[PDB]
Design a binder for this molecule. Structure first.
Ligand code: HEM
Length: 293
């Protein structure tokens, strides 16, 4: 019997309340600009939103964004989550200022805010995740390995109810940030901008001259002369003919990638949640730039 998690709006809160939380996150993103050699906290916040949602299992509705369980030791100490403590620390003063927002709402909103502030697509976002107790924390090992092939990736993402297009779209988030040897056993960025959300991941996969090398952790990764890298799982997207077609599509249509990413990312962040028929519609937050802030 799969658990049922019903969204419950934080008491009396509406769009304006959540836009304030968005703004606080966005202003802090602007302020704390030196983190990770001046990349800023955008990428790590996106990874945090993904890893807190990515524990979901469609078969029994365990894990997922609803319960905000990363706040518990078992999950924040998941080896797969190494480095995410930085995103958590970033969000702490936001949680302190807005103690009414649920942990799951904050983790997921962190990701949405980061994508939008980094010039990504608008990502509609729904409130109402409710904190669940420590015994609801999913065991480690539900997040994906990076050393695997296309068959692994395809099978892995079926557990999150994602199809080929959704998988390829979601992986485009690798435009952001970088791998860090001490965190994951991989080193290097996927591209040049690091803190601007674009379709660069796909362009790089297709256009760079990739060499299969061993990094300083004795793990294989694909490196280019430009100083970029791809994980084996990233590279698998051009090895598999079905993934390859989609990679070419996104590399050649920025708008299409934006639209598809937005849908897949919202879906990721909402997996496992039942929204009542009379729940508010998804919110689309204005960026700081759009507000003149
Ligand atoms: C096969 C699936 C995936 C694998 C194996 C994978 C693996 C990894 C690894 C090993 C890192 C480096 C961590 C570090 O050393 O700091 C990373 C970083 C990152 N991942 Fe993925 N990932 C996957 C999918 C995704 C998805 C679906 C998203 C979001 C939509 C995402 C967003 C990110 C971001 C933004 C970073 C940069 C973090 C930072 O710079 O601090 N990844 N991923």
């Amino acid at each position: 019997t799969p658990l049922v998690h019903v969204a419950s709006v934080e008491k009396g809160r509406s769009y304006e309340d959540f836009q304030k939380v968005y703004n606080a996150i966005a202003l802090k993103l602007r302020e704390d600009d030196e983190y990770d050699n001046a990349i800023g906290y955008g990428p790590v916040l996106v990874r945090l939103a993904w890893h807190t949602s990515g524990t979901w299992d469609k078969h029994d509705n365990t894990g997922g964004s609803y319960g905000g369980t990363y706040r518990f030791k078992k999950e924040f100490n998941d080896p797969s989550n190494a480095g995410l403590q930085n995103g958590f620390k970033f969000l702490e003063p936001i949680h302190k200022e807005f103690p009414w927002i649920s942990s799951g709402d904050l983790f997921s909103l962190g990701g949405v805010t980061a994508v939008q502030e980094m010039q990504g697509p608008k990502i509609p976002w729904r409130c109402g995740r409710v904190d669940t107790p420590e015994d609801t924390t999913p065991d480690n090992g539900r997040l994906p390995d990076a050393d695997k092939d296309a068959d692994y990736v395809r099978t892995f993402f079926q557990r999150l109810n994602m199809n080929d297009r959704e998988v390829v779209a979601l992986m485009g988030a690798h435009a952001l940030g970088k791998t860090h040897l001490k965190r994951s056993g991989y080193e290097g960025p996927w591209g040049a901008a690091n803190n601007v959300f674009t379709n660069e991941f796909y362009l790089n996969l297709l256009n760079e001259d990739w060499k299969l090398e061993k990094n300083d952790a004795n793990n294989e990764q694909w490196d280019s002369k430009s100083g970029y890298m791809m994980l084996p799982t990233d590279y698998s997207l051009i090895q598999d003919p079905k993934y390859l077609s989609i990679v070419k599509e996104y590399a050649n249509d920025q708008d299409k990638f934006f639209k598809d990413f937005s849908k897949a990312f919202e879906k990721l962040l909402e997996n496992g949640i039942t929204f009542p028929k009379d729940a508010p519609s998804p919110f689309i937050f204005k960026t700081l730039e759009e507000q003149g802030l």
